[PDB]
Paper text:
Calbindin-D28K is a major calcium-buffering cytoplasmic protein that is expressed at particularly high levels in the central nervous system (CNS) and absorptive epithelium (gut and kidney; Schmidt, 2012). Not only does calbindin-D28K act as a buffer for calcium ions, but it has also been shown to interact with multiple protein targets to modulate their function or catalytic activity. Calbindin-D28K belongs to a superfamily of calcium-binding proteins that includes calmodulin and troponin C. All of these proteins have a high α-helical content and share EF-hand structures that constitute the calcium-binding domains. Calbindin-D28K has a primary structure of 261 amino acids (molecular mass of ∼30 kDa) and is encoded by the CALB1 gene.
Here, we report the first X-ray structure of calbindin-D28K, allowing the first detailed high-resolution analysis of its calcium-binding properties. Five amino-acid residues, a backbone interaction and a water molecule complete the coordination of calcium in the EF1, EF4 and EF5 motifs. In contrast, the EF3 motif utilizes an interaction at Glu119 (position 9) instead of a water molecule to complete the coordination of calcium. At position 12 all four calcium-binding loops possess a conserved glutamate side chain that acts as a bidentate coordinating residue. Calcium binding at the N-terminal EF-hand (EF1) motif (where the electron density is more disordered) appears to be more flexible that in the other calcium-binding loops. Calcium SAD at long wavelength demonstrated that the N-terminal EF-hands are particularly flexible and possesses two calcium-binding conformations. Nevertheless, the N-terminal flexibility still manifests as structural disorder, with higher temperature-factor values in this region. It was not possible to build the two conformations into the electron density, and only one calcium-binding site is visible in the final structure. Here, we demonstrate that Asp24 and Asp26 are involved in calcium binding. Compared with the existing NMR model of calbindin-D28K, the X-ray structure is less compact, with the intramolecular distances increased by several ångströms across the molecule.
Author numbering: -2 to 65, 72 to 258
Write the structure that this text describes.
Amino acid sequence: GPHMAESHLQSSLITASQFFEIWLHFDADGSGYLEGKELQNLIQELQQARKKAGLELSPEMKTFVDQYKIGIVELAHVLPTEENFLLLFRCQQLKSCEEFMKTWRKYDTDHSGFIETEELKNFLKDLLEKANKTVDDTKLAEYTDLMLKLFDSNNDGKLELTEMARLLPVQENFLLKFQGIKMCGKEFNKAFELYDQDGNGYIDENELDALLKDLCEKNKQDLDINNITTYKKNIMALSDGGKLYRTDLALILCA
Ligand SMILES: [Ca+2]
Ligand SMILES: [Ca+2]
Ligand SMILES: [Ca+2]
Ligand SMILES: [Ca+2]
């Protein structure tokens, strides 16, 4: 359990289940990030643990302690995480927002608007096979279960776009700025109808640009008109060949 983290920080190599217990030990509010007292507790306990183990700090541990709000992905690279689990965070599909949006569309194969366990399993299996690793069904089931528990913020047993997007670095995750912009179904449906200006049933890139300019204007504290081109490019990656249907735009704007 999370109490075992003190023992885990002394390990030569940390299993995915151990990394999960470390995360839950320090993340006292379950917010998905270590900050303030939680981060200070990690810095103190990581150094005390390697000392108790009679070990030196690895180069990544030295660089982390020297330069310290950090998330789950950053912690996985600092610690001696087991190889096949750490490989799941060294994907260009989780480093570029545009490539992550294409990955979401690729792996939501039942068009449910969520990534369910079996879809997440297929994504992780494909990442491992791309790295030439032979997948063991038991460990893959364990990795999938732990990745879901780490990122399923609302505990509904599946991932929504904003949950899985937290695998991205803070700078690429534009969805953090769209948090308080999300609308209910009725209001969203009214906006979709307004912004489909030619009335052909979908929103194209020119129509999305008008939408994004209007959203920037009404949410000055959250969005930035100078990043419209990036917002446009990220959102167009969820489209069906340049066509944003109601369910595609709902992923970004509907609560
Ligand atoms: Ca926290
Ligand atoms: Ca799905
Ligand atoms: Ca969820
Ligand atoms: Ca249209």
